[PDB]
């Protein structure tokens, strides 16, 4: 995250850190005690699917304060329509091996109904994006969880104000190169407040980082609600990686 601030400890309680062999991989969003939403591309290169760890209640990477909860990732589900190394359909649903325990520091973000998300949330101007990504283009990653308020653009307006956005994406942020999500933030939440509650509307994808004339691109979660809901009702299958038909 570029041009943000530290998310005060516990104020981003749905934020997930994904690790592979103890190394920072990506962000994620907790939506239930056993389900995490991330970005498909995070998994393009995974060798040993068995070494994937999700951490909840994380804040400062430099210290252990005991609010952290680590779980193995039992399943990574990606839409059939996703092509590795690309941007469209950049979403993943992760099943934890064991539920996390809800605490003051570990809370799911609400996965909204599609209709609600489309008719209402999509019109909330500002939303929050977070992660432990790069603080600057070509810079070091953050040790403390960072958060950034970004405004959403209608795709028409995005294209106009820009100096390949599909229906499965949306634009948010700033074109002045001051404020953006960045490498290391992928899979993280774009969270939207409505009438006292926060909802998942976006997933940090990829592309650049605080590139002048450009906007951040986010996976449009509303397109995937039904897909996610169906999967969450399904029994686990052997083998970590699962490609599931979309729609």
């Amino acid at each position: 995250i570029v041009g943000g601030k530290v998310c005060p400890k516990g104020e981003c309680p749905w934020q997930v850190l994904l690790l592979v062999n103890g190394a920072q991989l990506c962000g994620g969003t907790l939506i239930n005690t056993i389900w995490v939403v991330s970005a498909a591309h995070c998994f393009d290169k995974i060798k040993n699917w068995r070494n994937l760890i999700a951490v909840l209640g994380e804040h400062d990477l430099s210290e252990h304060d005991g609010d952290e909860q680590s779980r193995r990732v039992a399943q990574v589900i990606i839409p059939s329509t996703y092509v590795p190394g690309t941007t469209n359909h950049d979403i993943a649903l992760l099943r934890l091996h064991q539920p996390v325990v809800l605490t003051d520091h570990v809370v799911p973000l609400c996965l909204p109904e599609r209709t609600f998300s489309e008719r209402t949330l999509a019109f909330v101007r500002f939303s929050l994006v977070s992660g432990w990504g790069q603080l600057l283009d070509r810079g070091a990653t953050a040790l403390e969880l960072m958060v950034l308020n970004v405004p959403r653009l209608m795709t028409q307006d995005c294209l106009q104000q820009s100096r390949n956005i599909t229906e499965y994406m949306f634009c948010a942020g700033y074109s002045d190169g001051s404020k953006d999500s960045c490498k290391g933030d992928s899979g993280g939440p774009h969270a939207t407040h409505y009438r006292g509650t926060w909802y998942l509307t976006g997933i940090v994808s990829w592309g650049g980082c605080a590139t002048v004339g450009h906007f951040g691109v986010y996976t449009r979660v509303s397109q995937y609600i039904e897909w996610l809901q169906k999967l969450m009702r399904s029994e686990p299958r052997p083998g970590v990686l699962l490609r599931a038909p979309f729609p």
Partner: protein
């Protein structure tokens, strides 16, 4: 109704045949008698920040 002002619903909104509308709430919430408002039914409902909710309790 639902497409406008969220049908007055705090959360989810369903249209019905007629000048009918039903509001709903996410799991971990219940709908109040006003037919629009949602109140938590659990300690840690989704999309609420405990340290902030407590800071306001």
């Amino acid at each position: 109704i639902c497409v406008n002002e969220n049908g007055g619903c705090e959360q989810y909104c369903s249209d019905h045949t007629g000048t009918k509308r039903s509001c709903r709430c996410h799991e971990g919430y219940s709908l109040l008698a006003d037919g629009v408002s949602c109140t938590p039914t659990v300690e840690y409902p989704c999309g609420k920040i405990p340290i902030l909710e407590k800071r306001n309790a």
